């Protein structure tokens, strides 16, 4: 709305978790820079008093900063002026059996902000508007039933009077959607599924006209057997993008459930799917659907980043997007028509490639999986070689700074049925270390890629996987946390390490900006967890438990301990 | 099956040798029972009327 | 043992919670003084992934550092070389009922060291010795049993090739003891009881020769009604003091049971007793009851402070102590000699003073407690003008620089039945602050003493109380952290605020130092939590819930939360 | 009751005005069960014996 436009227009301020509509994640504040970043320190610190994972990163609207935790989802509210001082907070009583329903720790990707309120999601489902000046709640509304599977976990999306809440729970057979709600009444507008009939999908008459080839109507249905989509997730956990001048949204649709791809025949559209839909009326404009019929739980929800650069001399609307499948896709946001799709890491094997023409991934059976058979040695693994990280990019070179992960996996499915409100995985997985780190044991990167191109220009390696994602900051800075527990800055020309800082414990967010006073400040969680820290979270041993992420991650604990809170750097 | 193959656009799916093209009937039947199929939808309608009562006060 | 004493006399180390044998926790490190303290910065951090209180404080042996948690009591072991890899650890595994016989928190006061070895306690009663190199278990032995209310929250202490260990627990009748176990197997040598036959308690032949009117045999009895002494509280869970020379620890016994006074006439000996005894038997030389028949749960086991200074012309072995009750004594720690009694503060009104002939306190009628009567306006508290807090000794300028409280109290108490294992307490509380501080709402103060004369030098004013303690360092700083969650450091001459930093959480252990390749370290645990946090810690909103401490502290959970960790500065 | 008047060396507690000297048959009668007061001894005891069991071996 007008007052969000406001925020994101004010210098110094952070009202939007990805950095704008836009979502490049990035800001022009420059006071911290190449030469004086070595001179950095710790300014204050903050505990939210919960552990678990500690996803996202704080909101500043104005001298207020606006800080979130993990379940039970606690909101803090600060006044700059003296950070010592809890303004107001909310504390929800939630029921601890929602908690058993979560498939990947009990976290909270952040908070959002619209008509002068915080707009904050319970992990039970319930999605409320608070003042933002006294945290008195206006509206509370239901999104999700934890009784049939269905969570909470990612930060609403707000645009112009909209806001956008996408429920998480494909492990459990939830049928994904994206649900738009009134910013000022909390009431329902509509809402677009993300499989079954046109109608509940949602698509607009001249849906995919420019690419017909992708598909149009009737997929929602005929890319399964019998009403296996029903239970075929889709969900949408991740991030959006918005373009304001279009007034299109866009996010992308979780993995089809089971895991187990012999129960479930079919491309099974519209899971895995790209989506640039009208923000008034939520009708698809076009959808790319990146991996038909799933096989390795590639959940197509990671960040989109919009951008516009020359195509050809062209100076063109773009979006990219790095999903789980290891491609590194670029789009016209306006039509969807495909540009780029290039493998982040040459270890992608699931893919020989994806043909620009047929704009689907030319499949290499080798590191398909199927029922009585165990696939080996596929890349990426069902962590993706991207997760929920959020990248940055930088305006000016035109590059966007990726946090990767760098590990594979041995898979192998069994049957099992569908009850509501129980997991509906049926695999079992052993991962392990991608075959490219240096002494073959790193499982993370950060990597600068070319949009236009999908080219890299360099690669920093990391011990762990890079699970939160990346800031760019014009003083020519990529600032990110890994999950051992260091906040550090590399040089954006090269990506040589200038500084870093030892925090409490890993970090599963990605850093945000500010300016407070005329001083810039640089703000991370802490509080390791999320899916590469199950096993640590849960006391876990059996290699094969967290689905497989325990054995991955077995070092982890020998290098961080839980935590959850917030620490705050500037000069 | 490499995905290029398409019975029509949209629409590339084929079966893996060895595996059936319709599971129905076969040894990877899921069985599902249309009762718990259908909780989802049930859920929806009983949580979109209560907001409504929300919103009608 | 001589390993302990290796350490103790290598420059930089910290083998002992108190600072050394004569538990003056100061240091002559000086690398951070007046001038550059305002450059000190942030080092690095570390979670511990446990919440509740965090006391105590880290063991710094060599290259290692030994961090211990709250409850389930958690040791990690880290080579400052790497602080970011964990070289072992222990996580006990304990049944969680332990928890609820616990009066004050699931807090733990930290690790001892000696022969090569970390000595450590659980909450649920054991104590354990592992190597300090591997964390292998050597020994593992019971010293308390919960099934009657006995729990372990005090630091172990190491003398000569002895562990001294108590029980806590008067709050639910269990009788005090101070236990010794043999460093190197874990053997019992003798325990020694606060209250019983002069056997049981351990008395030598000459005790009290210098002072027979502080009384000498079968007091232990004779001074309570039939068997009552039998659940009569004298848990020592405090700090203790060594003297090499003379052979004699020190230490004060605990607070009777119940805090019913009606419920137990009589001088209730040997409770509220400062000791000295003899290391190898045992056997008490000398005991000074400080506090008869005690009516405010003025739990007598704060710090002994053992300094040498001229009194009267000569050069004296003193013992200094500021119990709960609010006198400031001094003594000479040979023979139990009687030289300083002031009030820390003039609000003390339980006492009109104590005279120096008698021995004891010239009790004042009307903030006396007794049933079917509520005392008001009492001072101090029950939380005392000084608790668990260790405070610091400047040798040069012969000062001691107390973290004081500033609270007073109501009080009704209520007759109960003993059930072992069931709280045994006896009175409604309602606390609040003291009368004395800037705005009458200050229940804190940092107040500098001469030990010899009792008087003060100068005062700084907390808003919360100064449960931790302080540190002196030789630069001529006084370091100390706050409920709110601040670590500060003042001028020793003034008192004046050089220097401090926002931690996560708010600190309820005293800072350490150390040196680690020519640089000058400063440690302090995080992690709000003990008696004054209650209310936080367990949701508590009844304003006489908590002991009476809820009311009190309702305002700490606006300046902080739960955290649990360590945070590291230097230049 | 002022703390300063002794029956003996280390004894000088009195009965303050309105209290019995001996709380036994009075309202103020504790009438703690005798089985209840022995039990820490016998928690001792055989704590003790679990110990010694633990060196030995
Ligand atoms: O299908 C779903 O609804 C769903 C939900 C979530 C979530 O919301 O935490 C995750 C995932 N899937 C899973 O695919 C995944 O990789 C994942 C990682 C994390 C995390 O926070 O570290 N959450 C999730
Ligand atoms: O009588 C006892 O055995 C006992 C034990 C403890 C303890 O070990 O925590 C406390 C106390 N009493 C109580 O008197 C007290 O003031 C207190 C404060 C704290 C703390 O850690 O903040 N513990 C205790
Ligand atoms: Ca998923
Ligand atoms: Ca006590």
Sequence with gaps: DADLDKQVNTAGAWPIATGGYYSQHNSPLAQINKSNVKNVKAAWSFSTGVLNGHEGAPLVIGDMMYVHSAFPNNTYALNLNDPGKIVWQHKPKQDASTKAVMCCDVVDRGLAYGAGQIVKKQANGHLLALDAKTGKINWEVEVCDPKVGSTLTQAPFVAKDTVLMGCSGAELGVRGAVNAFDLKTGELKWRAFATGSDDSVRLAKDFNSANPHYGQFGLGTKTWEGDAWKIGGGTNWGWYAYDPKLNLFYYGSGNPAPWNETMRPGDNKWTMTIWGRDLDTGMAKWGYQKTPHDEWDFAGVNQMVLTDQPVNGKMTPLLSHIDRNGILYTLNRENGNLIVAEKVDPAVNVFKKVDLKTGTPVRDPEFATRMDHKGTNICPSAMGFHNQGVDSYDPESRTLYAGLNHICMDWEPFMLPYRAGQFFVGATLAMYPGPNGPTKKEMGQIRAFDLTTGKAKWTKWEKFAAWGGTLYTKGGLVWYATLDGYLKALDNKDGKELWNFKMPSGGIGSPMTYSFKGKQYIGSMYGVGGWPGVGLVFDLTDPSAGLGAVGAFRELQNHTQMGGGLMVFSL | ?57
């Design chain 2, 1 to 57: 099956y490499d995905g290029q193959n398409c019975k029509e656009p949209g629409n590339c799916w084929e079966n893996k040798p060895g595996y059936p093209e319709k599971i129905a009937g076969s040894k990877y039947d899921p069985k599902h029972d249309p009762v718990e199929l259908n909780k989802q939808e049930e859920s929806i309608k009983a949580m979109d009327a209560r907001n409504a009562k929300r919103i009608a006060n």
